[PDB]
């Protein structure tokens, strides 16, 4: 299952 | 721009025997950037029905892909993989050696 949070722009 | 040249292996999925259906593989790895041209050749001619794996990469960020096609080996047919990449001045051809 993919991470729903923590994938935010650099 | 970092540029890393592909390593190439050409081989069959299963032990190669004449008259027995099999898969011919071209595994390309260790390359960057991801754009790459891979053809499988039968007697010097490009094979049309070729599939490939979904692009992935290793810990060092270099890419790898498997290109493959169903084939039935015969005594006389010769096979090869032809690879082009930004790092290569001309296409690299690797012949299938049933012993490698």
């Amino acid at each position: 299952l993919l991470a729903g949070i923590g994938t935010v722009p650099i | 721009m970092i540029q890393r040249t592909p390593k190439i292996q050409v081989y069959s999925r299963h032990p190669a025997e004449n008259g027995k259906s099999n898969f011919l593989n071209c595994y390309v790895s260790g390359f960057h950037p991801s754009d790459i041209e891979v053809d499988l050749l039968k007697n010097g001619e490009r094979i049309e029905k070729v599939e490939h794996s979904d692009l992935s990469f290793s810990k060092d960020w270099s890419f790898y892909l498997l290109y493959y096609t169903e084939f039935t080996p015969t005594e006389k047919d010769e096979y090869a993989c032809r690879v082009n990449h930004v790092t290569l001045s001309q296409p690299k051809i690797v012949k299938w050696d049933r012993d490698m």
């Binding site: 991470a3 650099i10 | 292996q9 593989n25 754009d35 979904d54 992935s56 960020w61 498997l66």
Partner: protein, 275 residues
């Protein structure tokens, strides 16, 4: 034994028109189980292992939503990074991200990872403690500060220590027939003469899973590395792996040489000799 779940993401900018090419793949150990490709017609996360087909429509809708969100983040990043590095609009550039978790033989959390690269070079990575960041250069340092203020590491630590391992354990159960099965290497040796005085012995390992393996030559019972060639482990295309190692030997002296194979699927290491 030990197991892992990993996701790999690649976005490649397309100068001249449209959004980047985005490819995402998920693995359990050495088995791919899902994919998303922006060039594909479905625009859905798609199954790549039979045991994931057990998941209901809510899973596929959810994974599709999340993976599309991942793609948009990379799109933005490609623009941001182009500006950070004073690059022109003419060139193609690449962002890569990998994250996931390892569990031990007891299926409890061992380690988590979250790493990011721009044009094939380290940019920013989560440290082993899942609390701080390794930034390679000053652009990545600006990102580190942004991510520290936004508590990104805390969010990732929660996923990597919790959700990631919970779902890994679910997959391991559901795919037990293959995922918990080790396939021992099928081994043989070939011989070729290059001339009247020189011969090549090639020790083969085929059909094995997982991919981790060691193949070594000994001569008269001691390790031989000189005059050897070891190919990279390669996929067979049916979920298993192949490798070989070769040694050049004086013709007639083949019996001095033994090949040694170590693999999870073998209770004790194997020995081969030219017969």
């Amino acid at each position: 034994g030990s197991h892992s779940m990993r996701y790999f993401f690649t976005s490649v900018s397309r100068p001249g028109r449209g959004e980047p090419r985005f490819i995402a793949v998920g693995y359990v150990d050495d088995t791919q189980f899902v994919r998303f490709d922006s060039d594909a017609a479905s625009q859905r996360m798609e199954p790549r292992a039979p045991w994931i087909e057990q998941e209901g429509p809510e899973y596929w809708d959810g994974e599709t939503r999340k993976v599309k969100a991942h793609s948009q983040t990379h799109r933005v990043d490609l623009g941001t990074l182009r500006g950070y590095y004073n690059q022109s609009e003419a060139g193609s550039h690449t962002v890569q991200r990998m994250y996931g978790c390892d569990v031990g033989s007891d299926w409890r959390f061992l380690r988590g990872y979250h790493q990011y690269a721009y044009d094939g070079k380290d940019y920013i990575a989560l440290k082993e403690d899942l609390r701080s960041w390794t930034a390679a250069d000053m652009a990545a340092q600006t990102t580190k500060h942004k991510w520290e203020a936004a508590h990104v590491a805390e969010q990732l630590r929660a996923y990597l220590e919790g959700t990631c391992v919970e779902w890994l354990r679910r997959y391991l159960e559901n795919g037990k027939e293959t995922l918990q099965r080790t396939d021992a290497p099928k081994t043989h040796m070939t011989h070729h003469a290059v001339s009247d005085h020189e011969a090549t012995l090639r020790c083969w390992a085929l059909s094995f899973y997982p991919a981790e393996i060691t193949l070594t030559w000994q001569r008269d019972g001691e390790d031989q590395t000189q005059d050897t060639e070891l190919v990279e482990t390669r996929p067979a295309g049916d979920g298993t792996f192949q490798k070989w190692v070769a040694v050049v030997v004086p013709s007639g002296q083949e019996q001095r040489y033994t090949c040694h194979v170590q693999h999870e699927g073998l209770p004790k290491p194997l020995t081969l000799r030219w017969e």
